[PDB]
Design a binder for this molecule. Structure first.
Ligand SMILES: O=C1[C@@H](NS(=O)(=O)c2ccc3cc(Cl)ccc3c2)CCN1c1ccc([C@H]2CCCN2)cc1F
Ligand SMILES: [Ca+2]
Ligand SMILES: [Mg+2]
Lengths: 233, 52
């Protein structure tokens, strides 16, 4: 995350971190329930074997609430292609259930029609992760969040060098230096409605980070609600 | 602005229009309150709530 703020105690409890053999985060995820994590399909090629960490806000210390979970089942969208980044979604079933607590809680899955009419029409959403804090830099040791305006679909298509499919949406800023970045992929985009946060996107891709005239591109969760529901059953 | 377009039908969460009236509902882990509008958590860690 470029710009934005630290996630303070209990503020981003649905954040999950995918960690490789070396115990380093390489992608984010969203806690959906005690057994399930939402992530980006493209993250599944960035590590041969990986686990999921929850409850972490600082990769340098032990806060007492961190928990590592092994993955039992990886459910990747079969239509995902590296070429277009379309269908950039995957669900992970964990071997053991997540114990909810301070800094560990699921984000709500909304209903489609309502999410599209009421959540996606809000001014902003919130993106979070342990990703780079500058286009060129190392992964953040601290969990960060950033308020990102929803971007008009027309403006986003005009701004993009590549096709923005109906499974994608844009959020962020035209010129202001704030955006998601490398390592934030797969992480949560949530939208607040009456103090309840609903998952609305998956950090997917961007032409660099916080570039002028470019926005962050997210998987449109509302397009996959049935698929997610089936994957969880 | 009418029904669900009028301040979300006064629903805490999901708003649907059945017939010509508002029907509220909630995400899993919540129960619809007796007033048929508010959503009440069933446990200490309901989805979408910061743990503050
Ligand atoms: O995601 C990134 C960039 N990597 S990043 O690590 O800086 C990054 C990663 C994820 C981001 C997510 C958001 Cl929301 C914002 C910035 C990001 C920046 C570099 C270029 N890139 C990228 C990936 C896939 C595509 C495909 C689509 C059609 C054709 N190919 C296009 C891209 F530009
Ligand atoms: Ca820690
Ligand atoms: Mg920009």
């Amino acid at each position: 995350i470029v710009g934005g703020q630290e996630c303070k105690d209990g503020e981003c409890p649905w954040q999950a971190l995918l960690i490789n053999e070396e115990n380093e985060g390489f992608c984010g995820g969203t806690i959906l329930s005690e057994f399930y994590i939402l992530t980006a399909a493209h993250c599944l090629y960035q590590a041969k074997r990986f686990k999921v960490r929850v409850g972490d806000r600082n990769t340098e210390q032990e806060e007492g609430g961190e928990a590592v979970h092994e993955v039992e089942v990886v459910i990747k969208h079969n239509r995902f292609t590296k070429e277009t980044y379309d269908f950039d979604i995957a669900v992970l079933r964990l071997k053991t259930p997540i114990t909810f607590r301070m800094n560990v809680a699921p984000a709500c899955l909304p209903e489609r029609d309502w999410a599209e009419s009421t959540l996606m029409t809000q001014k902003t959403g919130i993106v979070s992760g342990f990703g780079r804090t500058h286009e060129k830099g190392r992964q953040s040791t601290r969990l960060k969040m950033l308020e990102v305006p929803y971007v008009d679909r027309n403006s986003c298509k005009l701004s993009s060098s590549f096709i923005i499919t109906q499974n994608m949406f844009c959020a962020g800023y035209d010129t202001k230096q704030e955006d998601a970045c490398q390592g934030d992929s797969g992480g949560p985009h949530v939208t607040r409605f009456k103090d309840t946060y609903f998952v609305t996107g998956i950090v997917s891709w961007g032409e660099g980070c916080a570039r002028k005239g470019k926005y962050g591109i997210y998987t449109k969760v509302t397009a996959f609600l049935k698929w997610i529901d089936r994957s969880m059953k | 602005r009418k029904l669900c377009s009028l301040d979300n039908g006064d629903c805490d969460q999901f708003c649907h229009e059945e017939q010509n009236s508002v029907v509220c509902s909630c995400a899993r882990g919540y129960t619809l309150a007796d007033n048929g509008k508010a959503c009440i958590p069933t446990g200490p860690y309901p989805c979408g709530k910061q743990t503050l």
